[PDB]
Design a binder for this molecule. Structure first.
Ligand SMILES: CC[C@H](C)[C@H](NC(=O)[C@H](C(C)C)[C@@H](O)[C@H](O)[C@H](CC1CCCCC1)NC(=O)[C@H](Cc1c[nH]c[nH+]1)NC(=O)COc1cccc2ccccc12)C(=O)NCc1ccccn1
Lengths: 99, 99
């Protein structure tokens, strides 16, 4: 699709068999979702945002469906104000900015 | 232009005949520029994101040019490490996300 920015670019994602809403965020290097139990192994990690550094859990090789397009990659789980799809997954689904 | 997301979407903006680098961010409701001394009265504001909130100064009707495209609007000045172009200015130039 072609998504305009008059509103927040929120889409439906499917992960862990759950539907959630997530923001497409090109200012984000990685994908950060709110607290959820994902299957497998995780490793603690620190990330920064405009407010500072937070701690997250890192899950590798997670399948996520974004607007029905499949992505397999890293997901950080932590205290984010919103579910955000960063560049690691935007590139997998061949998302671009245009003007 | 068609900006890919393999790298951070950094472009050149011009602000009062000053060229600067800015990240094009679809996950940003507002535009945030690095600390700078703009003539004018501002209004204090607090913006949030990963990590919490920071205090910024709000200036209205600032003219910026994103890759030779004029946008005039509300800008927040705070201690960001980078200039961030948000949705408020991204819509004025025709920016869309495509996948
Ligand atoms: C900051 C702009 C804007 C004001 C704000 N938007 C956000 O904070 C977005 C969402 C959390 C909503 C946010 O992801 C945004 O895209 C920011 C932009 C970033 C600010 C730091 C400087 C570089 C650029 N990105 C992020 O916060 C992600 C989080 C992440 C994932 N992996 C690693 N980090 N950061 C990054 O990818 C890269 O970070 C950094 C890179 C280099 C230096 C840094 C120094 C300090 C801190 C961070 C640095 C907003 O709209 N907030 C209102 C709001 C919206 C929805 C919900 C609640 N509140």
């Amino acid at each position: 699709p072609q998504v305009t920015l008059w509103q927040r670019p929120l889409v439906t994602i499917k992960i862990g068999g759950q539907l959630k809403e997530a923001l497409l965020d090109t200012g984000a290097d990685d994908t950060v979702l709110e607290e959820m139990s994902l299957p497998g192994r995780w490793k603690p990690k620190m990330i920064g945002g405009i407010g500072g550094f937070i701690k997250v859990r890192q899950y590798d090789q997670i399948l996520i469906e974004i607007c029905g397009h499949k992505a397999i990659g890293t997901v950080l789980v932590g205290p984010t104000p919103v579910n955000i799809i960063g560049r690691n997954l935007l590139t997998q689904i061949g998302c671009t900015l245009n003007f």
